[PDB]
């Protein structure tokens, strides 16, 4: 579902950017989804020169807090994965102890 939405939206990216670059080179509009060429003629979209345009504190603030959340997510990942791995050790060890009962007692392997 999600990949459908995002990826097809990206297909629209390729298609409309192709509409933009179809103003010149023709080896770009060719990749657009089939319905579009049947409809809107190429070279339709065009860029405009305009504005910085604007900026806000939310930029830097989210730029910080999201990285914080990211590195902390890495911490939770490393720690909980440490838990599951340690548990895997706890499980796996019994096998080879019983294999002490096997091989260390000389049995075929």
- Residues of this chain that interact with another protein (CB under 8 A) are 2-14, 16-18, 20-32, 37, 39-53, 58-67, 69-71, 73-74, 77-78, 80-81, 84-85, 88, 91-92, 95
Q: How far is CA 14 from the centre of its chain?
A: 18
Q: To the nearest whole angstrom, how small is the minimum distance from the Cβ of residue 106 to another protein? A: 21
Question: For residues 63 and 105, which CB has a smaller minimum distance to another protein in the complex?
Answer: 63
Question: For residues 70 and 104, which CB has a smaller minimum distance to another protein in the complex?
Answer: 70
- Comparing CA positions, the residue from 53, 51, 18, 48 lying closest to residue 36 is 18
């Amino acid at each position: 579902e999600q990949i459908m939405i995002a990826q097809t939206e990206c297909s629209l990216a390729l298609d409309m950017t192709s509409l933009l670059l179809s103003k010149f080179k023709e080896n770009s509009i060719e990749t657009i989804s089939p319905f579009l060429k049947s409809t809107v003629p190429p070279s339709s979209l065009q860029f405009s020169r305009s504005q910085p345009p604007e900026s806000k504190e939310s930029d830097a603030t989210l730029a910080k807090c999201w990285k914080e959340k990211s590195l902390t997510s890495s911490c939770k990942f490393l720690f909980e994965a440490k838990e599951r791995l340690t548990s895997v050790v706890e499980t796996e060890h019994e096998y080879y102890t019983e294999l002490v009962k096997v091989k260390e007692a000389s049995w075929p392997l």
